[PDB]
Structure formats: C-alpha cells, structure tokens
Amino acid sequence: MARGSVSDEEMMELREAFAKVDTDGNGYISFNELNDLFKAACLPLPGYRVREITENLMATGDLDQDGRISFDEFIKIFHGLKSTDVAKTFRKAINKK
Ligand SMILES: [Ca+2]
Ligand SMILES: [Ca+2]
C-alpha cells in the first residue's frame, strides 16, 4: 500500500505531463493551461464537455484554491481519486493522446 507515494513510471509520466504545459517552467498549472490543453487536443466533443473536465479537474485539483496546481497537487489527485474522467483525459491529452 501507499499513502501518496509515486512509482518511478507514474512519477515520470506526471513530471513530463506538467513540464509539457509548463511553457515558462514554473511548476504550476492554472485553468488556462488545462482548458487550452484539453481544447488543443482537438476532439469530437462539445464545449461544456471540455469546460467541465477542466473546471472540475481544477476545482478538485486545487486545495489552497489559488488558481494553480502544483506537481504534488496533480500527482496527489492521481494517486488519490480512483479512475476518473479528468485524470485519464489529462494524462492522455497531455500526452498528445
Ligand atoms: Ca505554467
Ligand atoms: Ca495551490
């Protein structure tokens, strides 16, 4: 078992995932990055859909409620919340699908 640890593979995946959208390399992911990311994916989906996954992901991804997600934050939600839609969509989208 594990509280919030992260495996080698999983960790790496998350690292690159954050560094991907991180154009300035600050280690933070705001709502603009999440939306622009899922939106940039260019998939057969409506507007409320992408806006929902991004809105929910951010709301359930930000504990301090500042408007930015940190490495630990995202990774934590991934190791915490079970198989979710926003999670899979993130790892996939961020990975260019
Ligand atoms: Ca950034
Ligand atoms: Ca925060």
From Swiss-Prot:
Location of Phosphoserine modifications: 5, 7, 30
Modified residues (Phosphotyrosine): 28
PTM annotation (N-acetylalanine): residues: 2
Record: residues binding Ca(2+) 1: 22, 24, 26, 28, 33
Processing after translation: Phosphorylated on a serine residue in response to costimulation through TCR/CD3 and CD2 or CD28. Serine phosphorylation promotes association with the actin cytoskeleton and targeting to peripheral cell projections.
Top-level taxon: Eukaryota
Domain EF-hand: 9-44, 49-84
Residues engaged in binding Ca(2+) 2: 62, 64, 66, 68, 73
Tissue distribution of the protein: Detected in intestinal microvilli, hair cell stereocilia, and fibroblast filopodia, in spleen and other lymph node-containing organs. Expressed in peripheral blood T-lymphocytes, neutrophils, monocytes, B-lymphocytes, and myeloid cells.
Modified positions (N6-acetyllysine) in chain numbering: 76, 88
Subcellular localization: Cytoplasm, Cytoskeleton; Cell junction; Cell projection; Cell projection, Ruffle membrane
Coiled-coil segments on the chain, per record: none
Self-association state and partner proteins as the record states: Monomer. Interacts with AIF1. Interacts with actin.
Clinical disorder: Chromosomal aberrations involving LCP1 is a cause of B-cell non-Hodgkin lymphomas (B-cell NHL). Translocation t(3;13)(q27;q14), with BCL6. Defects in LCP1 has been found in a patient with isolated coloboma, a defect of the eye characterized by the absence of ocular structures due to abnormal morphogenesis of the optic cup and stalk, and the fusion of the fetal fissure (optic fissure). Isolated colobomas may be associated with an abnormally small eye (microphthalmia) or small cornea.
Function as written in the Swiss-Prot or TrEMBL entry: Actin-binding protein. Plays a role in the activation of T-cells in response to costimulation through TCR/CD3 and CD2 or CD28. Modulates the cell surface expression of IL2RA/CD25 and CD69.
The protein's name in its UniProt record: Plastin-2
Species whose genome carries this gene: Homo sapiens
